[PDB]
Structure 1
Amino acid sequence: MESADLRALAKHLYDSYIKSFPLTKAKARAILTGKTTDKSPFVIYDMNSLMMGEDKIKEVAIRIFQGCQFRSVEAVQEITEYAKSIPGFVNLDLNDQVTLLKYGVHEIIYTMLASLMNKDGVLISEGQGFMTREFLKSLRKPFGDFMEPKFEFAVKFNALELDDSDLAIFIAVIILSGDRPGLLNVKPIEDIQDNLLQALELQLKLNHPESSQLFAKLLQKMTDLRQIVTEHVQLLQVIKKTETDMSLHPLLQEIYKDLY
């Protein structure tokens, strides 16, 4: 692929990204910065503010867990629509398409969650709410450990200042990972990823002349995302082993079943 083709690929992905994900980083940061004509998000900072704000957005910890799970389920659907737009993806063996989503969806979720985060909290419900980092961390033992690792990642990731156009290609790169366990036919997948990484390299050079080695920095984050999944899974294990009325949504259940 030569530059013109790489640029066309980047725009193709950006447009499908815009059609697949309702809340972009652009909108999100505008809200976070207060640089929108929109009314400021409702702030959830405790149990009272949560119950109270449930008009635009069991025990508290579990209500928050269920809200997050509802959102994850919707995010998986959005990511699946995006994947199907990546040139070459739907021509792959259907079983490999399933594998790539199975492993890729949570990594993408955390990537996009960063767009919604600052060091103080996170936008929820289409950006209509803002749940504080401190509040989440105060959740009783098991539950207070879930979001914090994502905040820590987001703070460092957000320092790279990527925009939606950069992110479109990055997310495609992550989806087209040829080393997912159980792939039937790696070559076609790695071929596509090769094109995407080329498009990403060019995108970052053009869009961020100031960030020397940004490509290299961003590549290292792909591996950070994998560790986040590992830790998250271990925490889900504790919820499974020692919790009351705790059950995952069937889509989440099939994603986590025999994951690694």
Structure 2
Amino acid sequence: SADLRALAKHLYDSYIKSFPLTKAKARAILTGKTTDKSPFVIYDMNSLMMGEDKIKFKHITEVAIRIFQGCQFRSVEAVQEITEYAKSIPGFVNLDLNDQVTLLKYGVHEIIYTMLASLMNKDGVLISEGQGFMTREFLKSLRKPFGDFMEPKFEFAVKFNALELDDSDLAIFIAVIILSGDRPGLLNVKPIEDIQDNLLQALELQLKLNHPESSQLFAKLLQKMTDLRQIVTEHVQLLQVIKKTETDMSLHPLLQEIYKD
């Protein structure tokens, strides 16, 4: 039980270090103060063109494309954040290297949607590391197939953010997603599930000591893993339609090499 506190704090610390924009920092920005500087708001086409001028995005080499490709940049950015984090989970580095890769290959989408929930409200999502805020309505207004890209993630974020999880809770949750013993292609599932049994224990205790008035929060949190998986499925189906019916490229074939799987 103290061992489990050690694990929960350890992961909280790794999560702080590995991820720039935490849920507290992001919640702050999304709702009035802490009133340092408001974010640039993109709400419509014209506010976008000024947003590229002002904020200055790292991914600028249409329009519904250019945003789609910002997500990809940021996703690939995030994957390295997630990989460094995975390496701090007790036992992860000592697993077979083939298993490590597999776990990350399948975990990362699910983890990206989880931490994206942290950056969203009902009305939009923080971009450029907190400097910006793109409206939900604007994203739903983009043409097919791009109008329906972001919406399944907002629908999710609304339900997930209602659980009112802290970063100390998310940190453990993230480690549980990564260590799923049912990913296709794993060679040695035993030690994976051992580690996950420990993370789940720690999550259940964390969840009790931190939210003792919210009954069965543990069970409700594990039920959202269903909703996570269904978003990765709805998203693979969309990448299908893009690679099928879009000149989603030109390209530097060296770019689409970077942004494949």
C-alpha change, 1:93 and 1:252, in structure 2 (3 Å) is farther
C-alpha change, 1:37 and 1:122, in structure 2 (3 Å) is same
Gaps of 5+ in 1: none
C-alpha change, 1:14 and 1:237, in structure 2 (3 Å) is same
Aligned partners of 2:242 and 2:248 also within 8 Å: no
Q: Give secondary structure in 2 for the equivalent of 1:56.
A: helix
% identical equivalent positions: 100
TM-score by length of 1: 0.93
C-alpha change, 1:117 and 1:31, in structure 2 (3 Å) is same
Task: Note the C-alpha offset of 1:224.
Answer: 1.1
Task: Note the C-alpha offset of 1:36.
Answer: 1.5
2:239 counterpart residue number: 236
Aligned partners of 2:65 and 2:248 also within 8 Å: no
Aligned partners of 2:107 and 2:177 also within 8 Å: yes
State the distance in 2 between where 1:87 and 1:187 align: 15
C-alpha change, 1:56 and 1:18, in structure 2 (3 Å) is farther
Q: Does 1:210 align with 2:208?
A: no
Task: Note the C-alpha offset of 1:248.
Answer: 10
C-alpha change, 1:248 and 1:166, in structure 2 (3 Å) is farther
State the distance in 1 between where 2:217 and 2:146 align: 34
Corresponding residue pairs, total: 255
State the distance in 1 between where 2:215 and 2:258 align: 37
Task: Note the C-alpha offset of 1:240.
Answer: 0.4
C-alpha change, 1:249 and 1:150, in structure 2 (3 Å) is farther
Q: Deviations over 1:18-55 (max 9, x none)?
A: 00000000000000012223211100011211110114
Output the aligned Cα RMSD.
Answer: 2.1
Aligned partners of 2:107 and 2:178 also within 8 Å: yes
Q: Deviations over 1:3-29 (max 9, x none)?
A: 000000000000000000000000000
C-alpha change, 1:237 and 1:64, in structure 2 (3 Å) is same
Task: Note the C-alpha offset of 1:254.
Answer: 8.7
Aligned partners of 1:69 and 1:249 also within 8 Å: no
Task: Note the C-alpha offset of 1:249.
Answer: 10
C-alpha change, 1:203 and 1:130, in structure 2 (3 Å) is same
1:220 counterpart residue number: 223
Q: Deviations over 1:168-199 (max 9, x none)?
A: 00000000000001111100000000000000
Task: Note the C-alpha offset of 1:84.
Answer: 0.5
State the distance in 2 between where 1:213 and 1:81 align: 31
Greater mean alpha carbon deviation, residues 36-45 or residues 181-190: 36-45
Aligned partners of 2:7 and 2:202 also within 8 Å: yes
Task: Note the C-alpha offset of 1:251.
Answer: 11
State the distance in 1 between where 2:170 and 2:255 align: 24
- Extract structure 1 runs of 4+ deviating beyond 6 A: 247-258
Task: Note the C-alpha offset of 1:256.
Answer: 9.7
TM-score by length of 2: 0.93
Greater mean alpha carbon deviation, residues 162-171 or residues 238-247: 238-247
Q: Deviations over 1:215-246 (max 9, x none)?
A: 00000011211110000000000000000133
Aligned partners of 1:239 and 1:246 also within 8 Å: no
Aligned partners of 1:43 and 1:129 also within 8 Å: yes
Q: Deviations over 1:149-175 (max 9, x none)?
A: 000000000000000000000000000
C-alpha change, 1:132 and 1:257, in structure 2 (3 Å) is closer
Aligned partners of 1:99 and 1:183 also within 8 Å: yes
Q: Deviations over 1:70-124 (max 9, x none)?
A: 1101111100110011010010000000000000001000000000000000000
Aligned partners of 1:56 and 1:128 also within 8 Å: no
